[PDB]
Design a protein around this motif. Structure first.
Motif, mmCIF file in Angstrom:
data_model
loop_
_atom_site.group_PDB
_atom_site.id
_atom_site.type_symbol
_atom_site.label_atom_id
_atom_site.label_comp_id
_atom_site.label_asym_id
_atom_site.label_seq_id
_atom_site.Cartn_x
_atom_site.Cartn_y
_atom_site.Cartn_z
ATOM 1 N N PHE A 1 6.756 40.502 -43.988
ATOM 2 C CA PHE A 1 7.817 41.185 -43.184
ATOM 3 C C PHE A 1 8.120 42.553 -43.796
ATOM 4 C CE2 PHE A 1 8.486 37.907 -40.333
ATOM 5 C CZ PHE A 1 8.335 36.718 -41.010
ATOM 6 N N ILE A 2 8.490 42.571 -45.080
ATOM 7 C CA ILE A 2 8.799 43.829 -45.772
ATOM 8 C C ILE A 2 7.555 44.722 -45.868
ATOM 9 C CG2 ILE A 2 9.482 44.830 -47.968
ATOM 10 C CD1 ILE A 2 11.063 42.182 -48.401
ATOM 11 N N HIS A 3 6.421 44.118 -46.226
ATOM 12 C CA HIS A 3 5.161 44.854 -46.354
ATOM 13 C C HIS A 3 4.684 45.376 -44.996
ATOM 14 C CE1 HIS A 3 5.599 41.990 -49.627
ATOM 15 N NE2 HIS A 3 5.059 42.919 -50.420
ATOM 16 N N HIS A 4 4.952 44.604 -43.945
ATOM 17 C CA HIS A 4 4.554 44.984 -42.587
ATOM 18 C C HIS A 4 5.309 46.239 -42.129
ATOM 19 C CE1 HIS A 4 3.676 40.742 -43.173
ATOM 20 N NE2 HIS A 4 2.599 40.930 -42.408
ATOM 21 N N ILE A 5 6.591 46.317 -42.484
ATOM 22 C CA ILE A 5 7.423 47.471 -42.118
ATOM 23 C C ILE A 5 6.889 48.755 -42.766
ATOM 24 C CG2 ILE A 5 9.693 48.515 -42.358
ATOM 25 C CD1 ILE A 5 10.805 45.644 -42.355
ATOM 26 N N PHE A 6 6.515 48.668 -44.045
ATOM 27 C CA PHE A 6 5.972 49.826 -44.768
ATOM 28 C C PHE A 6 4.651 50.304 -44.148
ATOM 29 C CE2 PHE A 6 8.979 48.469 -47.927
ATOM 30 C CZ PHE A 6 9.464 49.687 -48.338
ATOM 31 N N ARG A 7 3.791 49.354 -43.779
ATOM 32 C CA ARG A 7 2.498 49.683 -43.163
ATOM 33 C C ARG A 7 2.688 50.352 -41.796
ATOM 34 N NH1 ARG A 7 -1.079 44.331 -44.544
ATOM 35 N NH2 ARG A 7 -1.215 44.633 -46.779
#
Length: 22
Positions: free
Chosen positions: A1-7
């Motif tokens: 979730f957090i990593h997806h937002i950054f990508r």
């Protein structure tokens, strides 16, 4: 979730530059 937002931010930036470039 957090990593997806950054990508998503990186992809959005490239998309913006693509239109600005041509």
């Amino acid at each position: 979730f957090i990593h997806h937002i950054f990508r998503g931010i990186v992809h959005a930036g490239r998309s913006i530059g693509r239109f600005l470039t041509g």
